[PDB]
Amino acid sequence: MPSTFFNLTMAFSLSLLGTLMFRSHLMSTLLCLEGMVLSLFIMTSVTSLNSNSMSSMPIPITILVFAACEAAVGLALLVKVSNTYGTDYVQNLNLLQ
Amino acid sequence: FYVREPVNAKPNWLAVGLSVGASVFMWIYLIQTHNEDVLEYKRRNGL
Amino acid sequence: RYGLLAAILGDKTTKKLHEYSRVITVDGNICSGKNKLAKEIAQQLGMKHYPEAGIQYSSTTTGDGRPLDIEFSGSCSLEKFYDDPKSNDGNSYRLQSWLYASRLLQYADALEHLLSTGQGVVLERSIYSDFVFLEAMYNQGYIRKQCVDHYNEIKRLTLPEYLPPHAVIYIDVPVPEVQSRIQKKGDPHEMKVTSAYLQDIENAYKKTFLPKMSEMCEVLVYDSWEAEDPTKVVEDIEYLKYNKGPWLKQDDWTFHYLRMLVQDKTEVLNYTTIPVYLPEITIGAHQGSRIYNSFRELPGRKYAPGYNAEVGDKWIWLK
Amino acid sequence: ARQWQPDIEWAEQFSGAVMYPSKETAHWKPPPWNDVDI
Amino acid sequence: LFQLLREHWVHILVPAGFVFGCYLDRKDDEKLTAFRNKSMLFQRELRPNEEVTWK
Amino acid sequence: QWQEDPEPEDENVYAKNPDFHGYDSDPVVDVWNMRAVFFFGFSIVLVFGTTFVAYVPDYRMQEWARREAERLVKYREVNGLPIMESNYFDPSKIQLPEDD
Amino acid sequence: MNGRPGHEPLKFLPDEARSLPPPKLNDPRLVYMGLLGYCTGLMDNMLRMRPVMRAGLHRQLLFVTSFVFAGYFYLKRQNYLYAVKDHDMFGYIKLHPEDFPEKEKKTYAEILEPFHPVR
Amino acid sequence: MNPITLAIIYFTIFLGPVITMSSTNLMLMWVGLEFSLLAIIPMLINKKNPRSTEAATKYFVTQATASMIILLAIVLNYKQLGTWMFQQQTNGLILNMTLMALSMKLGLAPFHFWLPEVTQGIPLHMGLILLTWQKIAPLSILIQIYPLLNSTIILMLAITSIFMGAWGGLNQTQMRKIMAYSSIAHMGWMLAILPYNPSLTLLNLMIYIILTAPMFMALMLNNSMTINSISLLWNKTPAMLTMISLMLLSLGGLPPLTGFLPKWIIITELMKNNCLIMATLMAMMALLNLFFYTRLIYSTSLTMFPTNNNSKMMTHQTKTKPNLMFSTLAIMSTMTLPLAPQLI
Amino acid sequence: MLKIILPSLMLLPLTWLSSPKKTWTNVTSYSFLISLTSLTLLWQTDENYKNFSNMFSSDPLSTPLIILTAWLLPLMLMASQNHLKKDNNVLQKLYISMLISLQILLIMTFSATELIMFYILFEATLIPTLIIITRWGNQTERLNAGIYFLFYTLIGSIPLLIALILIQNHVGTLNLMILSFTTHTLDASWSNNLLWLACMMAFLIKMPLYGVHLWLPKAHVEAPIAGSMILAAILLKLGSYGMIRISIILDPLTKYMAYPFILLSLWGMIMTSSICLRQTDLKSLIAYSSVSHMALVIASIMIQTPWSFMGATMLMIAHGLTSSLLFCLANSNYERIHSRTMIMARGLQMVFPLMATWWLMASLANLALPPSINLMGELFITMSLFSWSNFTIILMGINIIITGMYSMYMIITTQRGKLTNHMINLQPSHTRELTLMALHMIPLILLTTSPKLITGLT
Ligand SMILES: CCCCCCCCCCCCCCCCCC(=O)OC[C@H](COP(=O)(O)OCCN)OC(=O)CCCCCCCCCCCCCCCCC
Ligand SMILES: CCCCCCCCCCCCCCCCCC(=O)OC[C@H](COP(=O)(O)OCCN)OC(=O)CCCCCCCCCCCCCCCCC
Ligand SMILES: Nc1ncnc2c1ncn2[C@@H]1O[C@H](COP(=O)(O)OP(=O)(O)O)[C@@H](O)[C@H]1O
């Protein structure tokens, strides 16, 4: 289990480096952002499962339910952006300078 | 007068009575609390 | 004050709009018959009638309603506009900027009456039509280019928020005939105005104001003869179909916010005072302080409406 | 004779999107008053 | 008597401050009255029919 | 040009109110703003104040010390004691560090 | 502090605070709160452009009487909190006596602070 | 906004911080943070101006990744201690990541860049909610983990925010931008004393809220997002010129006003704990904050900037009465230093 | 001491509540009497200083000032009735209140037992002063002057804040009484050598030292007359009062940590005195005169010999009164002339006979004429400085020669020579102008009769 947890944790860091190093299209980011939620969901489920801690399984899912809406909001902002610029490049989001 | 009349020309008599009446409830509770308090303090301690 | 609470517990403008509920405005041209038709169209259609915006229209609007001294009303003279075009002090631009602020107040007061009472609105020339005077003024030497930009910036900042005129009427009489109409009009300042300047005013309407509003609002063009016949024009208004235009999307929950804007005059013209320092517009601190420290001392103006005892307000000690 | 109230020029400096404008920092011009861009 | 129009309403503002002031400064004494007469240099014994040395 | 007022001249307040005392333009306020300033200023601060300050008694004890010296000098000289002994805190009271 | 034994998890002033003397209504502080209040009132009138002192004489009262009301019941508590602090502090000094031993300074006669001459 | 939606959102923006504060199961603290993120985004784009969409899309990405990092800390703890909550034993890195993520949500210092940009381009009213109500939920988590978080990490976070906030303020003339750069500095004072005296962390917050809430309702009374705009305050509404003056000097630490107490007791607590290195440098650049506060003072009060002729028109129409609470918190701020012993 | 203070606070209600026409006389008449109540503190028939109550105390050093602080409010309000008589009736009542708060705050600062009470009240006095200088300042540069006056004091102030909180932890209370009767002896470490600088630097800044005095020339130049009187008479002396009460602790270090300042001040005294010799703005020259005559004071509050301190207390009260007198008459010339230039307005005695007598007596107070407390003061600082090092007389000897030259030059090129041909005709002197002066000098004559009262703690 410890080895698998290491992989999942680095997966989250590789997904961390991704969302903290943008490149053009935002939908990539939001997509990356989701890669973390999967890694968190997998790790939470894994330890809960090998701790036989059934009282906590509710969490693995609460994490997904909140993460899904979180993403819903994220995509509506994205659609709003390629309606105002139509190209969804993190590049044009600089009016606030 | 005014072409556009004020909204406040004749007093909002509710706003007086909940402003005046509220304050007089505050005192009667406050002064009550003090004397009541003083007593609790006296009896709870020696006097 | 009208507020969401009213809305939540009623007060839905949508339940007060009638077939005659529209913002009708006759742009017209100088010394034309813009007023008569309007007063009449107002009379027969039952629409509220609003007079053309004036220097002291805001003072008549606020408090006592007695006309303010010129310097209190922004020191603008239409009279001086004419006798001294391209003046060193720029009274003409200051006149135009105050005029735009006055119609902004008039249009907003009109919208407030429309959404509250539900009676339709006739306001003569509108903010949308005001630009023709400035276009003509820049066409000749009256105003310089930046002056134009400053008006355009104020127009772009404030005019979009307000909903467009439902329909616009165009009482047109030719460049020469208005000048003879001017000639018999008694004032001498109206007389001797440039024929080319009048040329630029009506041309600006025909070139920009109609077509522009042609797509957006119900544009009705009437020749002089159709005019002076309020009955016929009134008939045609009652005839046009109020369909095309941004007004279609105004649901009750959308009107509420617009109402709360016009309900607040201090906001209607908030962008009219934007801190852009073109020289004509600038009060100047020493003169401005004296003018404010003098306007604020007028009876009933020192304190808010309802609280100044000079004019006879009472109950101040409990308000 | 008049405590000097600020003239237009004293006021001008406070305009601009940054008080101390440097190279390639004056490029920035103030944001639209309406908070809406063209 | 409190003639209005700034007649005695105001003129009595500052003077009244003084009195209130003196009322507090003689009240501060009342608080800081330990060592009332227990100081070494000035510890006389109470003279007959005198309540306290300094009041 | 940006609209602003033309320089305000300073009035010769001495042209009207030829009895101007410098406090206010209208004459009665001026008279009553010097009749109360010379009075409260000079007449009962420089006079009553100096009277009271002059009569503060033996300020900071320097009227007491010119007698206490005189009886100490009277007492010390007649009894043969040194007028200002050379150590004040008696040596006996002091417990000097013994070793050093 | 919290975690302190008996802590009332969400109460304002535990009844233990009854034992403490009640704040005298004229305590300078409550009187300050009063003035603090009157000023709030006056300020309001000013910002809303009303005769400053001759208006809202009902509000004036609500203010001077709201602030003051608040005071007595706040000070009543803050007073308790401080009083708990001593109960707590003094107690510890004893329960753990060795750590706070009573020093015994020497009469200056004995101590020898060095003398730096000004000259 | 269909008033129903307004209610649902506002309830969430308010249930968001409240769940965070009330719960102890960290998870429930995370979703409290999550609900705040979801509720604020709709209001941010209310004008739906091109600037706004930019604001929300930044705020959301910055908020979202930080939220994910906070969750990772909770997930990691769950495996280092079965508990769903930080304990004495917690691995230091676990707490440090939590510290960095919540500072990200507060935009405390290294991540300070998002806060000025997000504040610009959102209405002033939502800006007040963003700077004050939104900030309480993240700090509530930190106050709970007070003993665990490491002293060195936040001390440098705090010193960085004082420096960046002060520097940002001098250059910015955009009033809303200026409000953000003070909140980064004030947030630095709050965390500086967080590992030491949390009560003082809270005090340095309330006072900031009782100072900023009046200051912003002042900026919007005339809806001026420019200093030039606030400078013509003397013509639009003269009375607020007096208190705007004191509140801004109160926001900076000048001694007679209420604003000194938070800095004074934080310095007293840090010296009690021996950080006389750190405290000194903070207080010194804290003085830089007052310089930009007073520069605004100059423009708005001590000197009268020239106004446009149309300003006479706005004087004519009756002015919008400012809120009842603007008056009470304006005197509460700027005038409660004599009541300082009971405040702490 | 709440009669010198509470009745003062009540002045504020009177300036506001009173009629616009009668506001000036109610305020000036009442504070004259407020000064009379202040005189009661002078009744010290014993060495034991007067601890009125826990927070409020008055010892020989504070008492001579509290009375001066109360005395100038009347005068300040009489010197600013002219300018500030062109205002809107609510700008006046603000100026009058601002002046009132200064002495309320200054009376308390000079009469404060807890050193941090000094700090909070100490640094508060900047708020009223900055408003007086910036809001009513005539010149375009007062925004700048205000910045200089706020930052130089503020950057000095936060170090003192850290230092005083530091000693409270080290000793356990900032109460001047206890701190005095308790053993606080610094240990000449490198750190203490910093503490000492932290405590003294904030006081040394508002007491213009040669290194940091640029704030005072700029501030008094554009400041209105009332602000310039307050800065010279009471505001600068706040720094001296602080140095006397704070060096009770930090007793060992100043023996060797003072040399830097002492030399800065004595050389500074010469250069500041000299630039007065060719400065075209009269208010400029009085300000540098103020820097030099205050540079003597920081060189006596550091030598720390009984006479120094006594000389300092004599000179501070005396120079305070003299400087204002000079700043007040400078204003009277400025208002009729309308320019600060010294070269214009030559020959005034020919047209303003008495003001010239006041000018002459003010200058003789400025230079050290002997039957004056001003000379007694310098004579004493001079003596101790000589004791510190016999060579000091050379530098304190170039200052006396220069001080004579600029003091008389102010009289020679302003109040003598041929009259200016036709400047705006100079209206005669008001009785207010002359009294405002008489009120400054009559006390200078009375104090010189019995110097003991302003003799300091030593
Ligand atoms: C510790 C003390 C610190 C210093 C305290 C004194 C200074 C406070 C800081 C002031 C900062 C702002 C200075 C410049 C303000 C300019 C205000 C102004 O120009 O006046 C116009 C304003 C509105 O006018 P309005 O009242 O409507 O009537 C006239 C209409 N044109 O009318 C006004 O704004 C003027 C009236 C405002 C309300 C009264 C305030 C008067 C000052 C009270 C000082 C109290 C000091 C107490 C000191 C205690 C010390 C322990
Ligand atoms: C208090 C602190 C500072 C406050 C400054 C502002 C205060 C203003 C409000 C209060 C004003 C009055 C209080 C201050 C003046 C006090 C006057 C005074 O104390 O007179 C004392 C004197 C008695 O003499 P005494 O010293 O007791 O006897 C010595 C015994 N070894 O009694 C007298 O002899 C009175 C004599 C009156 C007339 C004397 C005139 C003598 C002039 C001599 C010098 C002439 C040349 C001066 C040259 C000056 C050049 C500038
Ligand atoms: N912006 C403006 N520029 C020029 N003139 C204006 C402006 N606004 C209003 N006016 C004046 O208002 C008048 C309205 O004319 P109208 O009442 O139809 O007939 P008459 O010209 O006889 O008064 C116009 O003549 C015009 O001079």
Distance of CA H279 to the CA centre of its chain: 20
Q: Is the CB of G43 under 6 A from ligand 1?
A: no
Give the number of other CB atoms < 10 A from CB of residue G48: 21
Q: How far apart are CA C78 and CA C68, in angstroms?
A: 15
Which residue from A9, A70, A95 is facing H50, i.e. has the nearest CB?
Answer: A95
Tokens 């617009």 identify what position?
Answer: C258
Per the CB < 8 Å rule, is G49 touching H330?
Answer: no
Nearest to C252 by CA among C1, C17, C5, C2: C17
- I119, β-bridge pairs: none
Contact present, D35 and H49 (Cβ < 8 Å): yes
Please classify residue I84 by burial: count the beta carbons closer than 10 Å to its beta carbon, then call 0-12 exposed, 13-18 middle and 19+ buried: buried
CA distance H259 to H266: 12
Cβ neighbors of C147 (< 8 A, separation 6 or more) are C90, C93, C138, C278, C280
Whether the CB-CB separation of G39 and G69 falls below 8 Å is answered with no
All residues of chain H having their beta carbon less than 8 Å from the beta carbon of residue G44 are: 324, 327-328
Amino acid at C78: L
Range(s) of the domain holding residue I231: 2-458
What's the gap in Å between the CA of F3 and the closest CA on chain I? 19
In whole angstroms, give the CA distance from residue G62 to residue G38.
9
Which of C7-45 are b and which e, b meaning 16 or more Cβ less than 10 Å from the residue's Cβ? beeebebeebbeebbbbbbbbbbbbbbbeebbebbbeeb
Q: In terms of Cα–Cα distance, which of H77, H49, H44, H85 is closest to H61?
A: H44
How far apart CA G96 and CA G78 sit, in angstroms, is: 27
H241 ligand 1 Cβ < 6 A: yes
Whether D28 and A95 lie within 8 Å, measured CB to CB: no
- Write the CA distances from H95 to H21, H85, H146, integer angstroms: 18, 11, 10
Residue C25 is given by DSSP the state E
Do residues H89 and H141 make contact, with C-beta atoms less than 8 angstroms apart? no
How far lies C230's CA from each of C25, C210, C249, in Å? 14, 21, 31
> How many whole angstroms separate alpha carbon C42 and alpha carbon C114?
13
Query: In this structure, are residues A74 and H60 in contact, taking their beta carbons and an 8 Å threshold?
Result: yes
Taking residue C221's Cβ as centre, other Cβ atoms within 10 Å add up to 14
Question: How many CB pairs below 8 A link C and D?
Answer: 19
Interchain proximity C303–G54, CB inside 8 Å: no
The answer for I339, left when phi > 0, alpha when psi is -120 to 50, beta otherwise, is beta
Residue environment code for I262-298, b if the CB has 16+ CB neighbours within 10 A, otherwise e: bebbbebbbbbbbbbeebebbbbbbbbbbbbbbbbbb
* Residue whose tokens read 């899904």: A68
Task: Please indicate whether residue I102, judged by its CB atom, sits closer than 6 Å to ligand 1.
Answer: no
Rounded to 5 degrees, what are φ and ψ at A25? -50, 135
Helices (H), C47-140: 57-61, 78-83, 91-116, 127-139
> Distance between CA atoms of C105 and C92, rounded to whole angstroms?
20
Give burial (CB, 10 Å; 0-12/13-18/19+) of F7.
exposed
Number of Cβ atoms within 10 Å of the Cβ of F46: 17
Please say whether the dihedral angle defined by the alpha carbons of residues I305, I309, I310 and I312, taken in this order, is positive or negative.
positive
The three state secondary structure string of chain I is CCCCCHHHHCHHHHHHHCCCCCHHHHHHHHHHHHHHHHHHHHCCCCCCCECCCCCCCECCCCHHHHHHHHHHHHHHHHHCCCCCCCCCCCCHHHHHHHHHHHHHHHHHHHCCCEHHHHHHHHHHCHHHHHHHHHHHCCCCCHHHHHHHHHHHHHHHHHHHHHHHHHHHHHCCCCEHHHHHCCCCCCCCCCCHHHHHHHHHHHHHHHCCCCCCCCHHHHHHHHCCHHHHHHHHHHHHHHHHHHHHHHCCCCCCCHHHHCHHHHHHHHHHHHHHHHHHHCCCEHHHHHHHHHHHHHHCHHHCCCCCCHHHHHHHHHHHHHHHHHHHHHHHHHHHHHHHHCCCECCCCCCHHHCCHHHHHHHHHHHHHHCCCCCCHHHHHHHHHHHHHHHHCCCHHHHHHHHHHHHHHHHHHHHHHHCCCCCCCCCCCCCCCCHHHHHHHHHHHHHHHHHHHCHHHHCCCC
Q: Which residues does residue C169 pair with via DSSP β-bridges, in sequence order? A: C26, C220
The alpha carbon of residue D16 is apart from the nearest alpha carbon of chain F, in Å, by 21
- Is there a contact between C306 and B6 if contact means CB atoms under 8 Å apart? yes
Method of determination? cryo-EM
H239 CB less than 6 Å from ligand 1?
A: yes
Q: To which residue do tokens 């601002």 refer? A: I98
Cα distance between residue H241 and residue H323, in whole Å: 16
Residues of chain G contacting residue I304, judged by C-beta atoms under 8 Å apart: 118
Question: I202 with I126: CB under 8 angstroms?
Answer: no
Q: Which of G47, I350, H38 is nearest to A67 (CA)?
A: H38
Q: Is C138 exposed, middle or buried (0-12, 13-18, 19+ CB in 10 A)?
A: middle
Residue of the nearest CA to atom 4 in ligand 3?
Answer: C133
Angle, to 10 degrees, between the axis of helix H239-251 and the axis of helix H198-221? 150
**Residue E16 burial class via C-beta count within 10 angstroms: exposed 0-12, middle 13-18, buried 19 and up:** middle
**Nearest-CA neighbor of H280 among I85, C296, I157?**
I157
- Helices I115-124 and I142-170, axial angle in degrees (round to 10): 170
- Distance, in Å, from the CA atom of C16 to the CA atom of C120, rounded to the nearest integer, reads 10
Residues spanned by the domain of H236: 2-344
Nearest CA among I127, I338, C97, D37 for reference residue H120: D37
The residue extents of the domains of chain E are: 3-53
Ligand 3 atom 3 nearest Cα:
C133
Q: Do I1 and E6 touch (CB under 8 A)?
A: no
CB of F56 closer than 6 angstroms to any ligand 2 atom: no
d(CA I430, CA I450): 31
Q: State which residue of chain H sits closest to G46, comparing Cα positions.
A: H239
Counted domains in chain I: 1
Element (H, E) at C259: helix C252-262
Residue I192 CB coordination number (10 Å): 16
CB-based contact G83:G13 (threshold 8 Å): no
Which structure tokens are listed for D11?
């006021």
Strands C167-172 and C23-26: parallel
Q: Is C119 helix (H, G, I), strand (E, B) or coil?
A: coil
Residues of E in contact with I28 (CB under 8 A): none
Nearest-angstrom CA–CA distance, C3 and C257: 9
Terminal C-alpha separation, chain C: 16
Cβ(C102)–Cβ(C118) under 8 Å?
Answer: no
- How far apart are alpha carbons D18 and D29 in whole angstroms? 9
Q: Which residues of D touch H45 (CB under 8 A)?
A: none
How far is the C-alpha of H97 from the C-alpha of I361, rounded, in Å?
Answer: 75
The CA-atom distances, in angstroms, between B21 and each of B13, E15, G99 are 12, 35, 57
Strand-pair partners of I281: I341
Verify C-E touch: 3 or more CB pairs within 8 A: no
Q: Dihedrals φ, ψ of G27, to 5°?
A: -50, 135
Which burial class, exposed, middle or buried, applies to B16 when counting CB atoms under 10 A from its CB (0-12, 13-18, 19+)? Answer: middle
Distance I94 CA to ligand 1 centre (A): 6
Q: Are B27 and B34 in contact (CB under 8 A)?
A: no
The CA I396 to ligand 2 mean position distance, Å, reads: 28
Domain of residue A70, CATH code: 1.10.287.3510
Edge-to-edge strands of the sheet including C218-223?
C48-49, C121-122, C23-26, C167-172, C218-223
3-class state of residue C24 by DSSP: strand
Which tokens is I405 given? Answer: 């030259």
Determine the residue type at I272. Answer: T
CB H63 within 8 A of CB A70: no
DSSP letter (8 states) at residue H47: S
DSSP state of C205: I
Structure tokens that stand for I395 in this block? 């530098």
| Residue H237 DSSP label | -
User: In total, how many domains does chain A have?
Assistant: 1
Q: Is C293 in the pocket of ligand 1 (CB under 6 A)?
A: yes
Phi, psi of C141 (to 5 degrees): -85, 5
Q: How does DSSP assign D1-38, residue by residue?
A: -------HHHHHHT-SSSSS--TTTSS--PPPTTS---
Q: Are I360 and I369 in contact (CB under 8 A)?
A: no
> Which ligand minimizes its atom distance to the CA of C106?
3
Task: Give how far B2 is from chain G: nearest CA, Å.
Answer: 17
Distance in angstroms (rounded) separating the CA atoms of residues C235 and C230 = 8
CB contact under 8 A, H302 and I143: yes
With contact defined as beta carbons under 8 Å apart, do I166 and I250 qualify?
Answer: no
CB within 8 Å of I442: residues ≥ 6 apart: F42, F46
- Residue H316 three-state SS: helix
**Two structure tokens written together for H47:** 């004008």
State the DSSP code for F8: P
Residue of D nearest to C160 (CA): D34
* Type of residue at C283: I
Q: Which domain holds residue A92?
A: 2-97
CB contact burial I194-207 (16+ within 10 A = b; e otherwise): ebbbbbbbbbbbbb
Nearest in space to I377 (alpha carbons), one of I441, I456, I324: I456
Task: Give me the amino acid identity at I145.
Answer: A
Token couple for C233: 């024009």
Q: How many residues does chain B have?
A: 47
Phi-psi region of I347 (alpha: psi -120 to 50; beta: other; left: phi over 0): left
Of I45, I323, I325, I449, the one to substitute when testing ligand 2's pocket (max ligand atoms within 8 A of C-beta) is I449
Q: How far is CA I420 from CA C18, I328, I334, I398, I434, in A?
A: 83, 21, 14, 33, 22
Is F95 an 8 Å CB contact of chain G? yes
DSSP string, A21-69: S--SBHHHHHHHHHHHHHHHHHHHHHHHHHTT-GGGTHHHHHHHHHHHH
CA atoms within 13 Å, Cβ hemisphere of H225: 20
